Amino acid sequence: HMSYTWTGALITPCAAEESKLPINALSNSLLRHHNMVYATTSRSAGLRQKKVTFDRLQVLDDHYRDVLKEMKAKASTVKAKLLSVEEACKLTPPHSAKSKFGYGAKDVRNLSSKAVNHIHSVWKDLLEDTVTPIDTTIMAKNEVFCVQRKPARLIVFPDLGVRVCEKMALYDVVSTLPQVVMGSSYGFQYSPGQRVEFLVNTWKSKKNPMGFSYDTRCFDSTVTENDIRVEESIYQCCDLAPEARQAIKSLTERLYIGGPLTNSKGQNCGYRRCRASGVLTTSCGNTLTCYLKASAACRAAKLQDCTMLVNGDDLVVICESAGTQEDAASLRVFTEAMTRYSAPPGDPPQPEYDLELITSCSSNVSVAHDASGKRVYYLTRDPTTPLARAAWETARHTPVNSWLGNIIMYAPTLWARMILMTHFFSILLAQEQLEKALDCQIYGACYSIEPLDLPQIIERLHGLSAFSLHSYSPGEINRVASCLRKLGVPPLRVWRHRARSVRARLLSQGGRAATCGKYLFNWAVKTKLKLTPIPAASRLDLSGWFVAGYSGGDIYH
Numbered sequence: 001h002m003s004y005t006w007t008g009a010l011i012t013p014c015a016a017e018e019s020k021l022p023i024n025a026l027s028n029s030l031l032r033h034h035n036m037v038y039a040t041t042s043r044s045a046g047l048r049q050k051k052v053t054f055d056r057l058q059v060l061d062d063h064y065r066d067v068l069k070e071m072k073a074k075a076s077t078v079k080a081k082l083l084s085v086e087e088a089c090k091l092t093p094p095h096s097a098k099s100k101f102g103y104g105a106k107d108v109r110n111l112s113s114k115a116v117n118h119i120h121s122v123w124k125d126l127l128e129d130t131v132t133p134i135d136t137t138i139m140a141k142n143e144v145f146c147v148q149r150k151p152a153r154l155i156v157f158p159d160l161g162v163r164v165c166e167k168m169a170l171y172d173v174v175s176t177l178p179q180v181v182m183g184s185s186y187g188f189q190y191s192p193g194q195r196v197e198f199l200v201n202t203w204k205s206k207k208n209p210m211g212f213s214y215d216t217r218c219f220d221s222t223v224t225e226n227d228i229r230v231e232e233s234i235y236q237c238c239d240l241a242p243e244a245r246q247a248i249k250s251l252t253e254r255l256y257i258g259g260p261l262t263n264s265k266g267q268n269c270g271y272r273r274c275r276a277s278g279v280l281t282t283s284c285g286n287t288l289t290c291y292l293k294a295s296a297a298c299r300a301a302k303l304q305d306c307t308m309l310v311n312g313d314d315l316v317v318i319c320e321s322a323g324t325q326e327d328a329a330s331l332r333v334f335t336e337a338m339t340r341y342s343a344p345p346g347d348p349p350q351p352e353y354d355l356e357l358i359t360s361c362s363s364n365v366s367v368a369h370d371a372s373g374k375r376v377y378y379l380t381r382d383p384t385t386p387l388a389r390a391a392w393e394t395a396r397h398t399p400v401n402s403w404l405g406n407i408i409m410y411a412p413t414l415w416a417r418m419i420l421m422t423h424f425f426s427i428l429l430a431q432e433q434l435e436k437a438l439d440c441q442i443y444g445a446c447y448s449i450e451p452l453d454l455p456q457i458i459e460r461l462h463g464l465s466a467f468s469l470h471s472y473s474p475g476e477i478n479r480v481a482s483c484l485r486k487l488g489v490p491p492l493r494v495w496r497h498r499a500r501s502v503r504a505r506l507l508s509q510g511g512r513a514a515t516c517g518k519y520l521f522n523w524a525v526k527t528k529l530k531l532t533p534i535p536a537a538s539r540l541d542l543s544g545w546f547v548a549g550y551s552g553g554d555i556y557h
């Protein structure tokens with residue numbers, strides 16, 4: 001029951017790959033320790049292949065079947081629609097991988113006759129054949145990190161025509177079903193502020209709170225054929241059109257359960273029998289399976305008054321504590337149960353008794369003060385990876401701007417405000433690119449955003465307090481300052497000096513640029529300006545921003 005079998009053919013690149021941090025005239029203003037930043041390449045795919053290849057054994061008990069029966073009861077209340085070919089086409093990212101059958105993502109988006117005719121033939125084939133394995137391409141992701149090197153993560157995806165068919169059959173399902181089945185435990189329904197509120201209220205709802213995060217080792221490779229068929233049985237509980245039922249059965253049998261792996265050169269690399277990382281159902285499937293295994297493991301470990309928070313493979317549990325020694329024993333039982341379910345741990349889970357010390361989705365709750373002096377909880381993270389990616393993006397244009405996603409998701413943080421906003425607004429000003437729309441990712445879905453709209457986006461997501469936060473925690477200040485010394489990033493006092501200049505330069509431009517100056521950089525002046533609601537903020541269409549997770553799902557809004 002191997003996650004993969006391999007032929008020996010290499011996982012090949014599609015273009016020239018850079019692993020060393022590119023340097024330009026702007027690089028040193030952000031980061032001096034260049035050797036600490038690197039990008040993963042196909043060169044390390046062979047090491048990843050070794051780590052993800054193992055036998056999976058699964059022992060399923062009554063706690064597992066009981067949780068599954070409850071999940072199916074909630075799933076039976078969902079009604080999902082088929083999307084038309086045209087609706088699915090418009091969800092395709094403009095730079096999505098082209099089809100092998102002679103059309104690309106722009107052809108799909110423009111509803112070109114060639115693209116639409118091929119999508120219709122893929123759809124008909126899904127309805128008529130429920131057995132033939134569907135081909136997939138395997139590729140090494142190029143991702144940026146700071147040292148202390150990780151091998152490249154692998155992406156496995158079917159052809160563009162198939163991806164459009166997945167949207168037709170399952171977009172509405174994967175967007176609506178997880179919140180129905182998991183309720184408040186479904187992490188992707190929350191903005192960062194709502195996530196903090198859920199975590200703080202949950203922590204407070206316990207008499208003696210204890211919490212832990214559970215890291216499954218290579219989660220996608222732990223997902224078995226049983227798990228994927230169980231996911232399909234949950235999807236089939238929905239009220240669906242008969243064609244959607246048939247397409248979901250076909251896609252499960254031909255694609256989701258497994259299939260052959262083809263490199264960028266057309267050679268057969270081997271065969272997958274675990275979760276594909278580049279399909280529409282990756283996020284929803286991972287979330288449901290992680291929630292199912294963890295809920296059942298909680299019952300096996302007799303954890304009292306468990307509240308879970310799940311985002312794909314990322315899991316955090318807050319429960320009633322039985323004292324440190326009993327909690328340590330309980331987590332070993334929780335881990336044993338997770339292992340029996342084929343979700344063994346990476347790092348063993350640790351009980352935490354301070355909410356601020358729990359890391360989940362690489363983030364933690366912290367405290368600052370608003371303009372009135374009131375204590376305010378907000379979400380932050382270690383800034384090392386955001387700063388290493390910002391250094392890369394300073395010298396190279398990338399298909400996804402992590403700096404922009406980081407400013408959006410972490411707008412109230414000390415590091416996103418002082419460093420990211422200051423650095424990137426300086427660059428955009430110099431290039432007169434404040435109005436140029438840039439792609440970013442929010443919960444795996446792709447958005448095209450103009451930097452000039454950031455004050456309005458931040459107000460809607462975090463409130464006006466994100467422009468007024470001060471008196472950050474000594475723990476948070478020290479982690480930021482320590483990260484800066486590690487990477488050779490100038491200290492926060494330099495950033496404050498640079499921000500007064502960026503602020504003045506934006507105010508000089510007038511209009512939307514002046515709004516950025518006023519709101520984003522009010523922290524940089526001695527005599528702060530009274531910040532009032534932005535009229536443009538109410539008109540913004542942010543409806544599908546925090547609805548569901550779509551990592552690897554090829555979704556554009």
Ligand SMILES: c1ccc(NNc2ncnc3[nH]ncc23)cc1
Nearest residue numbers: 192361405406409441442443444
């Ligand atoms: C709440 C939960 C999870 C996170 N993930 N971290 C992120 N960092 C950068 N860009 C992002 N886009 N979508 C998420 C995300 C952030 C907040």
